[PDB]
Design a protein around this motif. Structure first.
Motif, PDB file in Angstrom:
ATOM      1  N   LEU A 289       0.805  -1.210   0.000  1.00 49.86           N
ATOM      2  CA  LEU A 289       0.000   0.000   0.000  1.00 49.86           C
ATOM      3  C   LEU A 289       0.854   1.283   0.000  1.00 49.86           C
ATOM      4  N   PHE A 290       2.028   1.242   0.621  1.00 52.79           N
ATOM      5  CA  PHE A 290       2.930   2.390   0.548  1.00 52.79           C
ATOM      6  C   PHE A 290       3.364   2.634  -0.902  1.00 52.79           C
ATOM      7  N   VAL A 291       3.696   1.565  -1.613  1.00 53.12           N
ATOM      8  CA  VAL A 291       4.096   1.713  -3.010  1.00 53.12           C
ATOM      9  C   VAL A 291       2.928   2.239  -3.846  1.00 53.12           C
ATOM     10  N   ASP A 292       1.715   1.801  -3.518  1.00 51.63           N
ATOM     11  CA  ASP A 292       0.519   2.317  -4.181  1.00 51.63           C
ATOM     12  C   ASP A 292       0.412   3.838  -4.024  1.00 51.63           C
ATOM     13  N   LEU A 293       0.694   4.325  -2.818  1.00 48.99           N
ATOM     14  CA  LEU A 293       0.652   5.761  -2.540  1.00 48.99           C
ATOM     15  C   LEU A 293       1.772   6.514  -3.271  1.00 48.99           C
ATOM     16  N   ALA A 302      -1.743   3.678  -9.627  1.00 51.53           N
ATOM     17  CA  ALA A 302      -2.439   2.930  -8.588  1.00 51.53           C
ATOM     18  C   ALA A 302      -2.250   1.448  -8.850  1.00 51.53           C
TER      19      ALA A 302
END
Ligand SMILES: Nc1ncnc2c1ncn2[C@@H]1O[C@H](CSCC[C@H](N)C(=O)O)[C@@H](O)[C@H]1O
Ligand SMILES: Nc1ncnc2c1ncn2[C@@H]1O[C@H](CSCC[C@H](N)C(=O)O)[C@@H](O)[C@H]1O
Ligand SMILES: Nc1ncnc2c1ncn2[C@@H]1O[C@H](CSCC[C@H](N)C(=O)O)[C@@H](O)[C@H]1O
Ligand SMILES: Nc1ncnc2c1ncn2[C@@H]1O[C@H](CSCC[C@H](N)C(=O)O)[C@@H](O)[C@H]1O
Ligand SMILES: [Ca+2]
Ligand SMILES: [Ca+2]
Ligand SMILES: [Ca+2]
Ligand SMILES: [Ca+2]
Lengths: 339, 339, 339, 339
Positions: A289-293, A302
């Motif tokens: 999720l950090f990489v998504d952000l 995304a």
């Protein structure tokens, strides 16, 4: 009650201070501290002289870092030493963490995060409002920026490349095309592993030349054509297998459909497309999720679930045949054919 | 072996991603999410509408935060709830973490950290080069920045005010002067505890009037004069006790001496000075050293040990009498007499 | 007869060409080729670009080395790969062979061998005739040359240090002196193992400063005096134990006696001298005799037997008590007293 | 893994010490040790006196050499004896290895190798940079150097002369010219086998006279003209066959083209040129590539494949007519005519 509240406050404060912990690491790698500690301990004085840093301030920085586990403070003679954590920061094109630390050290990287609120209000990249240009335009025009990014992506790719080559049976393919293949480590790994295969690497012109250097120096220039180009305009027609790794997650739905539709057009009925990317499942790890952000901030991208990809594939005349595991993490290989 | 290196790499990567974790909190507080969760769970859709966020992007942000313990993701109906960590972020002038989070959310704050390397190279504040103005000038010209700062400082001070009033025997003092006393909570606590005492507060004009509000609102308006302006001009001669809390650490050695010499000339032979600030000892906590680095970044300042302060006092005609504990952090009251 | 003669001629011709094989390795190591092959096979072209070599010539060099088992020539696409022998040459401060290869790469090292005939005609070092200066003088003036020597010596002396400290019981000694103790590895190991002991390291001034840095880094600066000096002029008086490791084999008989005689006069009746060096018998291994010849070439020295040492010690008013094992090599400890 | 790494390290160390082994042979032949052992075993003492060596040091050298198989160390009464390997070192103008050993003993030969790195960096001969003069210039000015070289070349040539004479049909030719024919063994062997043939030998002046001596002694003085000259300037025109053995590999591409153009100009349209040299083919022997490297070091030359020679010949107006085997080894006869 009170003690519980105080503990929560301390926990949250540690999170806030975590921003400064990261930035201290950025400065340590920017100055080249870890490289200077490979031959035993050195004084803050000596490290300051060698790096061009202000002595008292470098000492403060090093004390702080040692306090949180990065470098050891020997506690005598003003000496500091390499440790397990500081050692992973040594410059190395094969190290994701070392290359990423240096990538993140860049002021324009940090500044995109300055404007995170903008991204949260829009679903679009903050990079542009922060830096006055897009991430792709900066890396196109600015060789230093291009180098920091391509190194950080390239280190990750080196690891994944061996995994992909081992996880998918390419033995039936005569030709492969890697779309937006970066510096070409994926194509190199697959070619090495499957001697009868020939390939084409498609990339932005400056990046394509970097891929040419990597592929040529690994003795693969006679097996891989380099195609400088734009995947919104061009996909080489009629290959047996197309590969697209960590590309689609840079793009919004409309742009993904544009890419997929051009790929679909180029495919033979028997062709296969491998979308290789981070997939969101039911309980994603924080890191995923950090990489998504980060994708949001840099390029307005995304991460997607398989069903989200499948929906876009449908609008593009494609369909999922199966999805395969690929090493640790969220990366999966989604094998796709024409509908 | 390689299992140890893997752990070392994950640990450092978690540090890097911690910057983003901090920024996600900054955004959650800037948008005002916590205060919308006080009457039960709410959907990301409702929170996004209330805050002016892009629905899917706020959902991503909240999902991420919940995976690292901030807010609870209920896992159905798009619902998020307040939890122990997010409750800490509720707007409340008495909350150090809530006010500091909102202060840190400001782009000029994060931007100072962007140029941390400059501070390490020069020993000077990065704020000025990052932002084109000093921290003091900004808080003079921009009432929003001023308010963010005064709130962040005022919350911390509220806790400290009672501790100081209880640690130091002010009985027998007729007059007290708080030099740069912020919103006046310290002066208020001491006046409450010692009915004989009359006070004088010195501050820049805007927060001086804020101190007037706090003191008036507590029925102490008659017992405390407010002198707005540069304290170099306003510091009254002949007070029994002078107080200076979290001021000296904002300044470099030479500026601290300038302030100390100015106070010394105002002191009667039997007067006392209380320097109330964070002291570095032989076992400084990580969080203590983080604040030291923040001081450098924002204002070019630093935390000091007792002996470091003692050296400066001895350049200023002053002597340490006693050093008293204050609370459970690094705050100490340094009781000082004129030589 | 005809065939047997042809075989003998080939064997001898192989010996002659062996000199060129050695030099080819020296150049490969000097250029840094093995380091470049740790990530898999690379082309001679790419290796040449990365090392600053003339492309066609590096290709010739690598092709030749591969035909004798050093590196692998893949026989396609200009590729060369690391193999078992070339991996030995990776730059590792802990590797005797790798550091020695870099030491031998130096032109002044090879040039000493140019004049081997002089040594065989006279018994004197050939280094001086060839280079116009002595080995000690060169390493005193040229810090680059000294560093090459340092790395080659250090790679072994670091292991030897722990061995001596575990092989001799220093529990009864108050003071120790290491005569010509290099960068102080031996002194450091002994001081670590024997907390009650104090030391003095005697070395040539430039080396003494190197020892200072090492012992300080090991936290032993308070327990070991650094004495810049000349063991032909000065030996610290009245220590309980004197150590002299891999020093005496550098010197001819008359110089050994000079050193030993100054040591004798510095010794208390109960003092002990430990000579730590390769002690040979009358039929040593080839490699051991090769090192003996190198001693002649570089410094006019020689390996000796215990009897030969005894003879020299008795000439210096010193008496062998006994000798002890250490390191399962030719290296032994000879324990000596005033006669 | 543990054993394998130590095995590799020992193997590499042995390669390194191989340079000293070669130098030890150089000294033994320079001093003339082998010729003193033809009438039975002798002591080191007697050998040292006969050769003007230092007794103790020669004993070291001989004991070392014997441990690696050169000379027999009888292991009693200080005696040494000839063995199969030391026997091939006996002085004999017809022995390639004996003459090569004595040629390599020269300090200027060894010193060229000292600067191998220069050659690898530049593609140029290291001889000039190491010796302050060229190989050709030194052998022109220094009669001792010229003799060492001419003897080492001449021994090889004697072995090849008969082979060339028996491998090519010189029947249809009336005149022959040997270009850079050394001491004339080739011309002599060809004139012997072909009575009607008349020869001219082109060589550097000092060398030409040595050729005259050889050819006169063979009774061919009236059949062969001796032509002192420079083959960059003068080639006798109109001969039926031109010969050039072990000359072209001394020269770089441009310089070979210069020589070829001269020869082409001199040839009649129905003439033949015989380039007799070491040819590089598929999978060359190590010893072949060792000689290739020596050519680079000494004169800036290189061994070539037939295709490489064909490229140069084509640039020079010449063409390969056919390639013929010559003895056992890499030597071939490349028969050439005008394009
Ligand atoms: N319009 C376009 N055409 C082609 N390539 C593009 C592009 N826009 C971006 N890219 C490339 O898309 C890549 C995404 S990063 C992923 C790189 C590589 N596939 C890997 O997995 O390591 C970048 O290398 C960038 O150069
Ligand atoms: N020249 C000056 N004259 C008066 N006040 C000053 C000043 N420079 C800085 N200050 C004040 O110094 C304060 C530092 S923050 C500490 C405030 C307060 N003592 C507390 O502990 O809460 C700020 O409020 C700022 O307004
Ligand atoms: N005249 C002199 N006085 C003191 N030291 C000397 C010297 N001449 C040479 N040396 C030192 O003798 C040493 C020989 S090498 C051995 C070093 C160390 N004892 C070890 O075992 O590793 C070198 O360090 C050199 O600096
Ligand atoms: N400029 C020049 N003119 C004529 N001969 C030359 C020359 N430069 C070098 N040489 C000769 O070229 C020879 C190379 S060695 C080969 C000699 C002989 N063909 C043989 O096979 O035995 C040397 O004898 C040298 O004297
Ligand atoms: Ca051989
Ligand atoms: Ca190929
Ligand atoms: Ca001597
Ligand atoms: Ca033995």
């Amino acid at each position: 009650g009170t003690a519980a509240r105080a503990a929560a406050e301390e926990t949250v404060n540690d999170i806030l201070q975590g921003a400064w912990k990261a930035r201290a690491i950025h400065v340590a790698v920017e100055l080249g501290v870890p490289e200077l500690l490979q031959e035993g301990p050195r004084t803050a004085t000596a490290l300051a002289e060698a790096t061009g840093a202000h002595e008292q301030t470098l000492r403060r920085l090093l004390r702080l870092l040692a306090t949180v586990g990065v470098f050891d403070d020997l506690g005598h003679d003003d000496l500091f030493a390499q440790n397990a954590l500081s050692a992973v920061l040594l410059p190395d094109p094969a190290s994701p963490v070392a290359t990423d630390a240096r990538f993140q050290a860049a002021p324009w990287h940090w500044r995109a995060w300055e404007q995170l609120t903008h991204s949260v209000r829009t679903g679009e990249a903050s990079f542009d409002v922060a830096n006055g240009t897009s991430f792709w335009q900066l890396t196109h025009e600015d060789p230093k920026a291009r180098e920091l990014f391509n190194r950080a992506m390239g280190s990750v790719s080196l690891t994944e490349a061996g995994q992909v080559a081992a996880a998918y049976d390419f033995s039936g393919a005569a030709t492969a095309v890697d779309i937006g293949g970066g510096r070409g480590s994926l194509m190199a790994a697959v070619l090495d592993a499957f001697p009868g295969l020939r390939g084409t690497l498609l990339e932005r012109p400056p990046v394509a030349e970097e891929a040419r250097e990597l592929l040529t120096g690994r003795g693969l220039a006679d097996r891989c054509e380099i195609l400088p180009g734009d995947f919104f305009e061009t996909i080489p027609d009629g290959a047996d297998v197309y590969l697209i790794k960590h590309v689609l997650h840079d793009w919004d739905d409309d742009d993904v459909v544009r890419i997929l539709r051009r790929i679909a057009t180029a495919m033979k009925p028997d062709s296969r497309l491998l979308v290789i990317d981070n997939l969101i499942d039911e309980r994603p790890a924080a890191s995923t999720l950090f990489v998504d952000l980060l994708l949001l901030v840099l390029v307005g991208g995304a991460e997607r679930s398989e069903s989200e990809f499948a929906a876009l594939l449908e609008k593009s005349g494609l369909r999922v045949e199966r999805s395969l595991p690929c090493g640790a993490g969220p990366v999966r290989i989604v094998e796709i054919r024409r509908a």
